Amino acid sequence: XXXXXXXXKXXX
Amino acid sequence: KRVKSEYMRLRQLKRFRRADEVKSMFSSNRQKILERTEILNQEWKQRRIQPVHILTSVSSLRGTRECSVTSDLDFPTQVIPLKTLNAVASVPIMYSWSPLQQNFMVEDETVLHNIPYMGDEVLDQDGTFIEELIKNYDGKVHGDRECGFINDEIFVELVNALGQYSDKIFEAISSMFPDKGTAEELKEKYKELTEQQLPGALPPECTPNIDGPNAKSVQREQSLHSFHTLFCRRCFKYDCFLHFHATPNTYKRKNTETALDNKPCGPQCYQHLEGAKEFAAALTPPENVEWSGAEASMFRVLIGTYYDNFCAIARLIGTKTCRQVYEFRVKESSIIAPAPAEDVDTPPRKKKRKHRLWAAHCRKIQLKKDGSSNHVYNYQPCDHPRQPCDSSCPCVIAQNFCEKFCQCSSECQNRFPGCRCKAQCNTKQCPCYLAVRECDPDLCLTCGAADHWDSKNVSCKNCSIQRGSKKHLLLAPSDVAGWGIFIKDPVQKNEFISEYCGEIISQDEADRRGKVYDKYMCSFLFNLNNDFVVDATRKGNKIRFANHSVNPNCYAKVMMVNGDHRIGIFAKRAIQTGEELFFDYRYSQADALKYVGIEREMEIP
Amino acid sequence: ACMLFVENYGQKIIKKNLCRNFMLHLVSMHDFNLISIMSIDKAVTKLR
Amino acid sequence: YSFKCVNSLKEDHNQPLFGVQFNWHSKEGDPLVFATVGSNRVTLYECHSQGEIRLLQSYVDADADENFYTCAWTYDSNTSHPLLAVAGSRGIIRIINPITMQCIKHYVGHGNAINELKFHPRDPNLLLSVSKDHALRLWNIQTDTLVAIFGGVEGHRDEVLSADYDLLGEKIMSCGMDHSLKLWRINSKRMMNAIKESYDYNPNKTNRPFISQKIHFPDFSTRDIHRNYVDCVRWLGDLILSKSCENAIVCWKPGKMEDDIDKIKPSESNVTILGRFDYSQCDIWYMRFSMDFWQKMLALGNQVGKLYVWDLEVEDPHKAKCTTLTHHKCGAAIRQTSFSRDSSILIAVCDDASIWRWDRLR
Ligand SMILES: Nc1ncnc2c1ncn2[C@@H]1O[C@H](CSCC[C@H](N)C(=O)O)[C@@H](O)[C@H]1O
């Protein structure tokens, strides 16, 4: 379920 | 044990035949590309371009910045002066918003289907709220293990999984996929395998529209069944997008409202033959001419309409006379069940209906349920199939009138009396003005409620929503915050301003939306009632872009527009041309400082 | 609303030739007490 | 497939780099000049043989404390001079001419910030503006007339960045943060007309300002294509390539494999997916891939600085023979991708104010 977290204006 | 690998084994074989297929359009597309590229190349060749020229030194602009692009290689680092750019005034941000003048219901959203971006400065601290959000959505994120679906022969292979040849396979089908359904849905689709396609945009039986020549002789109720199902009398429209099912339309009505001037007014009427006329009243060899089933359709449609006026039937359908219709009406009635066609007068005729007893009911209405004066609920039709308007009356437990749209009959004392304000329904002595509702056109004959509903001049003021007496707004930045709304012409205190129109949504979704909204600090939401809330995010009115004051020139009054909870604006003080438009949002004080802190005032004392 | 509509769109209805179904909608309003018999004649006349 | 990064440069501003553009609108033999924008600096340059790229004239913002994001070339038939438009954090589209030395055109009216720029393939004077606003504003720069918005009552609830015209110019793709790919038919007579009357106007004609349209029902849309964002989708002619942060690239066609794009009803939602030319280690959004002016090759870099590039010929994803050009020095992030006006020269543009040029080993 962690893959569904995306906060990627830039790199992680 | 599951169908996925077999589906893979079935998908690969159909994938095998797709290799030339996928090659086909790819190759074909290039040919389409081939013509396209050169055609635009031709005109590109036709249109001459101007070679660019580099900057030269600007004498009057000597005092400027200089820069140089660093060659990552050993190449010389070329140097050029900077040069600025033109100036444009900024405008406040605004979401792409859609105009609205009405109200709509959207069902609650049961899936995340969105993970919006945010500036990413607060997630470093409160980053759990997003997965708190999906908790509110109960872990139902978009794009969860869908991977297309199962269809065609592989769908047929699901049916074979039900039988034993083969046990965990069909249970697995109803387990993993988001659209797994259940193994019972496989059994029904096994029965659906007999057709494999929808029979049509109709029930499986033949019910074409009558003007369609192949229309079956569908009986009255079945033919009428479409309308009531897809019509809403509450807002007198088909699919009233603001009210889904309403009620059966069976009702009581007197049938003797007809003068009944039965005459041989049409060649071969029910008259023109004494005996034929004689048998008409008693039943309350036809000609060789036939009847279409479509013709028979209105016959059962129209017999309910009057059951008696065969001449009007003839005045409707021009195929045959009143006779050979009245004959068939006799002939049709020779088979079908009788009709109610009943007349009543009710025990209450006059007196005992002094409106003070409704106020005496209202004492009971207040002495137990309305004392809080905050418990407000959505109107519902208090419909009493056999019971009277009892203590458990749907509107009584809802604590409101028996509306005319309800089926509490006319004798019901919980009906609102009327609007009898002979100067105007607009001010304190008018109890309908104290009523949350616009003065009903049927009631305030004393204030011109229905008088010239097309016109725009009347003494009453509680007559806005019924026509839409809207003002002329303005769009611009506001003194206090961002965009703003302004009035064009002077208005007086205690006067109408256009209603706060918007989408109607539920509390939880709004609570789900608000926390997201408040994370970006958004509020297009007005507290509708104890049960619902009005959304104005995407759709919205024209006043949605105004701002706030603690002492504004205008205020909002809660409205009950014909059983609809609505919200307009009214002027606190005098207004002349070119004024701002604010109102008290009525938040918490911590909220108010957080949200509407700007007040636009200095310290006089 | 009844005549003011059909004053403009009956020829559209005529072109559509859904007359036998349009009255079916008109059946409902009398069944809904919205319009009595008196305006019923108006519509059929405006067809013709 | 046979290339090499032969030169690389960097600008001293050190802010992240942004929209790259190669002047395909040009003439053969003429000195090819490319352009790109950073945070607040607009940059225009031309490469040359022997690995040299002469510095060219370029400007910079000095008042609006606003980061510029996107840009594209421009050309005027009346003056016969090319121009170029740029966008960013405030979205106000600005079109400058090196000959005129100044952008003397004002266009304000977007909400937050433009995230997509493209002129019409045929019209040299139109650009629909997808922004952070969830709005689609088309502009006739030549006549200084705004044109209809797209979406609205059925717009994009969430952000949308990627959009594209078909090469012929009758349908528009659009996809973004919402994972929906809403798409409209230009060839609609309603706005086929609207453009025609849009093309002509006078503020002195009447008091009423020009009234453009508001189209709200896209022909097709879906969200099942990508469980996450979709940000790099362009027209593969009749086909439509696609990809997401999942390091996966694919095409799709509306309906079934036998269904024409024009003949489908707007109400249909059936889908057909096809294509596997994928990648890895680029798990984020907000990059721009690139496809050649001749539509014969496909290219992209990776945030770790490697390049994922292939052709557009009969080579198909039945096996998808990979091609993974790269360099060791460039690894920070290739935000932007662009070529020369051929399969010869490529610019690799990195986040850290730096650029890198790949050249053909023809
Ligand atoms: N008087 C006030 N002072 C500070 N913020 C205010 C305010 N009135 C409204 N707001 C903020 O503005 C939001 C409403 S949307 C309006 C935004 C802004 N006034 C504009 O028109 O562009 C609310 O979330 C509230 O927090």
Coordinates of N, CA and C in Angstrom, one line a residue, chain B residues 487-596:
Chain B
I487 N -21.9 45.4 -6.0 CA -23.2 45.7 -6.5 C -23.1 46.9 -7.5
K488 N -24.1 46.9 -8.4 CA -24.1 48.0 -9.4 C -25.0 49.2 -8.9
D489 N -26.1 48.9 -8.4 CA -27.1 50.0 -8.1 C -27.5 50.0 -6.6
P490 N -27.9 51.2 -6.2 CA -28.2 51.3 -4.7 C -29.4 50.4 -4.4
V491 N -29.4 49.9 -3.2 CA -30.4 49.1 -2.6 C -30.6 49.5 -1.1
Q492 N -31.8 49.1 -0.6 CA -32.1 49.5 0.8 C -32.0 48.3 1.7
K493 N -31.9 48.6 3.0 CA -31.8 47.6 4.0 C -33.0 46.6 3.9
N494 N -32.8 45.4 4.3 CA -33.8 44.4 4.3 C -34.4 44.2 3.0
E495 N -33.6 44.0 2.0 CA -34.0 43.7 0.6 C -33.2 42.5 0.1
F496 N -33.8 41.9 -0.9 CA -33.3 40.6 -1.4 C -32.0 40.7 -2.1
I497 N -31.1 39.8 -2.0 CA -29.9 39.6 -2.8 C -29.9 38.1 -3.2
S498 N -29.4 37.9 -4.5 CA -29.6 36.6 -5.1 C -29.1 35.4 -4.2
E499 N -29.8 34.3 -4.3 CA -29.6 33.2 -3.5 C -28.3 32.5 -3.7
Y500 N -27.7 32.0 -2.6 CA -26.5 31.3 -2.6 C -26.7 29.9 -3.2
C501 N -26.8 29.9 -4.5 CA -27.0 28.6 -5.2 C -25.7 27.7 -5.2
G502 N -26.0 26.4 -5.2 CA -24.8 25.5 -5.2 C -25.3 24.1 -5.2
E503 N -24.3 23.2 -5.4 CA -24.5 21.8 -5.3 C -24.9 21.4 -3.9
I504 N -25.7 20.4 -3.7 CA -26.1 19.9 -2.4 C -25.4 18.5 -2.1
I505 N -24.7 18.5 -1.0 CA -23.9 17.3 -0.7 C -24.1 16.9 0.8
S506 N -23.6 15.8 1.2 CA -23.7 15.3 2.5 C -22.6 15.8 3.4
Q507 N -22.8 15.6 4.7 CA -21.9 16.1 5.7 C -20.5 15.4 5.6
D508 N -20.5 14.1 5.5 CA -19.3 13.3 5.6 C -18.3 13.6 4.4
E509 N -18.9 13.6 3.2 CA -18.1 13.9 2.0 C -17.5 15.3 2.2
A510 N -18.4 16.3 2.6 CA -17.9 17.6 2.8 C -16.9 17.6 3.9
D511 N -17.1 16.9 5.0 CA -16.1 16.7 6.0 C -14.8 16.1 5.4
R512 N -15.0 15.1 4.6 CA -13.9 14.6 3.8 C -13.3 15.6 2.9
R513 N -14.2 16.4 2.3 CA -13.7 17.5 1.4 C -13.1 18.7 2.2
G514 N -13.8 19.0 3.3 CA -13.4 20.2 4.0 C -12.0 20.1 4.5
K515 N -11.6 19.0 5.1 CA -10.3 18.8 5.6 C -9.3 19.0 4.5
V516 N -9.6 18.4 3.3 CA -8.8 18.7 2.2 C -8.9 20.1 1.7
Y517 N -10.2 20.6 1.7 CA -10.4 22.0 1.4 C -9.6 22.9 2.3
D518 N -9.7 22.6 3.6 CA -9.0 23.5 4.6 C -7.5 23.3 4.5
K519 N -7.0 22.2 4.1 CA -5.6 22.0 3.9 C -5.1 23.0 2.9
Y520 N -5.8 23.2 1.8 CA -5.6 24.3 0.9 C -6.4 25.6 1.3
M521 N -7.1 25.5 2.5 CA -7.9 26.6 3.0 C -9.0 27.0 2.0
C522 N -9.9 26.0 1.8 CA -11.0 26.2 0.9 C -12.3 26.0 1.6
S523 N -13.3 26.9 1.3 CA -14.6 26.7 1.9 C -15.6 27.3 0.9
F524 N -16.2 26.4 0.0 CA -17.4 26.8 -0.8 C -18.6 26.1 -0.2
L525 N -18.7 26.0 1.1 CA -19.7 25.2 1.8 C -20.5 26.1 2.7
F526 N -21.8 26.0 2.7 CA -22.7 26.6 3.6 C -23.4 25.5 4.4
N527 N -23.5 25.6 5.7 CA -24.3 24.7 6.5 C -25.7 24.7 6.0
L528 N -26.2 23.7 5.3 CA -27.5 23.7 4.8 C -28.5 23.4 5.9
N529 N -28.4 22.2 6.5 CA -29.3 21.9 7.6 C -28.6 20.8 8.5
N530 N -29.4 20.3 9.4 CA -28.8 19.2 10.3 C -28.5 18.0 9.5
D531 N -28.9 17.9 8.3 CA -28.8 16.6 7.5 C -28.0 16.8 6.2
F532 N -27.8 18.0 5.7 CA -27.1 18.2 4.4 C -26.4 19.5 4.5
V533 N -25.6 19.7 3.4 CA -24.7 20.9 3.2 C -24.6 21.2 1.7
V534 N -24.6 22.5 1.4 CA -24.5 23.0 0.0 C -23.1 23.1 -0.4
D535 N -22.7 22.5 -1.5 CA -21.4 22.6 -2.1 C -21.5 23.7 -3.2
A536 N -20.4 24.5 -3.3 CA -20.3 25.5 -4.4 C -18.9 25.5 -4.9
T537 N -18.3 24.4 -5.1 CA -16.9 24.3 -5.4 C -16.7 24.5 -6.9
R538 N -17.2 23.6 -7.7 CA -17.1 23.7 -9.2 C -18.2 24.4 -9.8
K539 N -19.4 23.9 -9.6 CA -20.6 24.7 -9.9 C -20.8 25.8 -8.8
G540 N -21.4 26.9 -9.2 CA -21.6 27.9 -8.2 C -22.4 29.1 -8.8
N541 N -22.9 29.9 -7.8 CA -23.6 31.1 -8.1 C -22.7 32.2 -8.6
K542 N -23.2 33.5 -8.6 CA -22.3 34.6 -8.9 C -21.8 35.3 -7.7
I543 N -22.5 35.1 -6.5 CA -22.1 35.7 -5.3 C -21.0 34.9 -4.6
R544 N -20.6 33.8 -5.1 CA -19.6 32.9 -4.5 C -18.3 33.5 -4.3
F545 N -18.0 34.6 -5.0 CA -16.7 35.2 -5.0 C -16.6 36.5 -4.2
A546 N -17.5 36.7 -3.2 CA -17.5 37.9 -2.3 C -16.6 37.6 -1.1
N547 N -16.7 38.4 -0.1 CA -15.8 38.3 1.0 C -16.6 38.6 2.3
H548 N -15.8 38.8 3.4 CA -16.4 38.8 4.8 C -16.2 40.1 5.5
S549 N -17.2 40.4 6.4 CA -17.0 41.5 7.4 C -17.7 41.0 8.6
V550 N -17.2 41.6 9.8 CA -18.0 41.4 11.0 C -19.1 42.4 11.1
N551 N -19.1 43.5 10.4 CA -20.2 44.5 10.3 C -20.5 44.8 8.9
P552 N -21.0 43.8 8.1 CA -21.2 44.1 6.7 C -22.5 44.8 6.4
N553 N -22.6 45.3 5.2 CA -23.8 46.0 4.7 C -24.9 45.1 4.4
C554 N -24.7 43.7 4.4 CA -25.7 42.8 4.0 C -25.5 41.5 4.7
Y555 N -26.6 40.7 4.8 CA -26.6 39.5 5.6 C -27.4 38.4 4.9
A556 N -27.2 37.2 5.3 CA -27.9 36.0 4.7 C -29.0 35.5 5.6
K557 N -30.2 35.2 5.0 CA -31.3 34.7 5.7 C -31.7 33.3 5.1
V558 N -31.9 32.4 6.1 CA -32.2 31.0 5.7 C -33.6 30.9 5.1
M559 N -33.6 30.3 3.9 CA -34.8 30.2 3.2 C -35.4 28.8 3.0
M560 N -36.7 28.6 2.9 CA -37.3 27.4 2.6 C -38.1 27.5 1.3
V561 N -37.4 27.4 0.2 CA -38.0 27.7 -1.1 C -38.8 26.5 -1.5
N562 N -40.1 26.5 -1.2 CA -41.1 25.5 -1.6 C -40.6 24.1 -1.2
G563 N -40.2 24.0 0.0 CA -39.7 22.7 0.5 C -38.2 22.5 0.3
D564 N -37.5 23.5 -0.3 CA -36.1 23.4 -0.5 C -35.4 24.3 0.5
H565 N -34.5 23.8 1.3 CA -33.7 24.6 2.1 C -32.7 25.4 1.3
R566 N -32.9 26.7 1.3 CA -32.0 27.6 0.5 C -31.6 28.8 1.3
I567 N -30.7 29.6 0.7 CA -30.0 30.7 1.5 C -29.8 31.9 0.6
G568 N -30.4 33.0 0.9 CA -30.2 34.2 0.2 C -29.5 35.2 1.0
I569 N -29.4 36.5 0.5 CA -28.7 37.5 1.1 C -29.6 38.7 1.2
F570 N -29.5 39.4 2.4 CA -30.3 40.6 2.6 C -29.5 41.7 3.2
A571 N -29.8 43.0 2.9 CA -29.0 44.1 3.2 C -29.1 44.5 4.6
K572 N -28.0 44.7 5.3 CA -28.0 45.1 6.7 C -28.3 46.6 6.8
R573 N -27.8 47.4 5.9 CA -27.9 48.8 6.0 C -28.2 49.4 4.6
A574 N -28.0 50.7 4.4 CA -28.2 51.3 3.1 C -27.0 51.1 2.2
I575 N -27.3 50.8 0.9 CA -26.3 50.6 -0.1 C -26.5 51.6 -1.2
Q576 N -25.5 52.3 -1.7 CA -25.5 53.0 -2.9 C -24.5 52.4 -3.8
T577 N -24.2 53.1 -5.0 CA -23.4 52.6 -6.0 C -22.0 52.3 -5.5
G578 N -21.3 51.3 -6.1 CA -19.9 51.1 -5.9 C -19.6 50.6 -4.5
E579 N -20.3 49.7 -3.9 CA -20.0 49.2 -2.6 C -19.5 47.8 -2.6
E580 N -18.6 47.4 -1.7 CA -18.3 46.0 -1.4 C -19.5 45.3 -0.9
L581 N -19.4 43.9 -0.9 CA -20.5 43.0 -0.5 C -19.9 42.0 0.4
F582 N -20.1 42.1 1.7 CA -19.6 41.1 2.7 C -20.8 40.5 3.5
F583 N -20.5 39.4 4.2 CA -21.4 38.9 5.2 C -20.6 38.1 6.2
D584 N -21.2 37.9 7.4 CA -20.7 37.1 8.5 C -20.7 35.6 8.2
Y585 N -19.5 35.0 8.0 CA -19.5 33.6 7.7 C -19.8 32.8 9.0
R586 N -19.7 33.4 10.2 CA -20.1 32.7 11.4 C -19.3 31.4 11.6
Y587 N -18.0 31.5 11.8 CA -17.1 30.4 12.2 C -16.8 30.5 13.6
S588 N -15.9 29.6 14.1 CA -15.3 29.8 15.4 C -14.3 30.9 15.4
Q589 N -14.1 31.5 16.6 CA -13.2 32.6 16.7 C -11.8 32.2 16.3
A590 N -11.3 31.0 16.8 CA -10.0 30.5 16.3 C -10.1 30.3 14.8
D591 N -11.2 29.8 14.3 CA -11.4 29.7 12.8 C -11.3 31.0 12.2
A592 N -12.1 32.0 12.7 CA -12.2 33.3 12.1 C -10.8 34.0 11.9
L593 N -10.0 34.0 13.0 CA -8.7 34.5 12.9 C -7.9 33.6 11.9
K594 N -8.1 32.3 11.9 CA -7.4 31.5 11.0 C -7.8 31.7 9.5
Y595 N -9.1 31.9 9.3 CA -9.7 32.0 8.0 C -9.9 33.5 7.5
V596 N -10.6 34.3 8.3 CA -11.1 35.5 7.9 C -10.6 36.7 8.7

